[PDB]
Amino acid sequence: PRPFNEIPSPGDNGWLNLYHFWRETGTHKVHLHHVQNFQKYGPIYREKLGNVESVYVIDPEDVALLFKSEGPNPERFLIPPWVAYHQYYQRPIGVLLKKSAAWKKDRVALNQEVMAPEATKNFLPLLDAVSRDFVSVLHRRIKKAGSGNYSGDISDDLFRFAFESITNVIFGERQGMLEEVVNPEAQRFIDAIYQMFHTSVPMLNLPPDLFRLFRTKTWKDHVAAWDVIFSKADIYTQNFYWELRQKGSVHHDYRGILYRLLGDSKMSFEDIKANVTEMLAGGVDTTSMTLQWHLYEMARNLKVQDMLRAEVLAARHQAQGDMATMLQLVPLLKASIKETLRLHPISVTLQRYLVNDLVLRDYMIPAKTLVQVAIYALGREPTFFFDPENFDPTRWLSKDKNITYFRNLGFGWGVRQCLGRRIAELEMTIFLINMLENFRVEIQHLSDVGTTFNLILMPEKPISFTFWPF
């Protein structure tokens, strides 16, 4: 059993490692840094970047061992600029920035309202209403274009879509972000979210002491972005709280996540509002970029697009129109979302701090070490996925359940997987049902679109789609 120090490594100097990382690859290509590192060191390595050292793994078999020894209250890497903002400006923290018993308490509360089948079944008509309106927007744009046809970059529209969707299941109220004339304050919120992520990157491998010193301007801009996030989340929650007392009726119809938490949960109001803030901010840039990638992948692979349409048409007929029923009848659609997140993870890595010592690849890794699963590098790895550059949803249907062992990692694992996983799955699946029924998707002068690291992974450049009424 080899000691920790024997794990392949660029070296022990974190600032030198950081220097070589910045000059050769760059901060916005961290996902490539991982790929190259694995090609250089083999299937496991350690790297100190600035002050933080991680062990990095790629093999689903090492992944399984990692998540096997996970404790009751797991911890992932905390993003230093995010943590500092919350501490210094004393903002209430949600489930994302809590650990141990305080994390569990929020998570358990939130799980009853956000992850539980009994609760999540209520999301269906709320998300469908938004998706149906998105389809209307595009139909309007086709009519207006006068060519039976619409071409355009719909990123901003996908951000507005994702925002209507998360706000609708939380508040049970439409924000009108899919209308022709849009709330400019709600837009200012949507933009702050992207700014928060983008401005995170120059500060990523530095202790807070070095932020204000070498990234003063970035820190300033980062703080302004979180201020918008928090201001408007507070206003939303607070208005909701008072309007509840103004209309005070024990409604029998479903009204949204917030109503349920405020009316019957163990959480304090301040805890609730902290988590409303995080769920809102978490929901805008994640589902939107993933859908964009999906549409891109359907445009790149027209046969696969044809198959998915046929599945959804069959499913709408077989279910005689009912959405709840449809969702149990689209296994290829669900697999295609899994296939989209493999090629295009939102999260470059998953991370866990070990609670106990652990052996991986005959190396001894001591308790409290950060271990990172290189999710991006994994999905591109030709030894772990057959023909990895090919978008093939059937891959997830294979009854050879050796082929999918610890491969579906886009939303993470165990008790501290994505909190918004059901919202995201349901929102994207419903979004794609509606699109597939209404439009054929193409990209004129199609080319390979790469990935940039903006804390979340995002496309490197715009994608201009063409839509045809089906």
Binding site: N111, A116, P331, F406, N408, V415
Partner: peptide, 28 residues
């Protein structure tokens, strides 16, 4: 056992059940 508490948000014990299983339920 039952760490997420009967919510289908772990695997310490449908299409979503299938996903929790390919990483190895009692509460469903």
């Amino acid at each position: 056992f039952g760490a997420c508490e009967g919510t289908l948000a772990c695997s310490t014990c449908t299409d979503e059940e299938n996903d929790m299983l390919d990483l190895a339920l009692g509460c469903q």
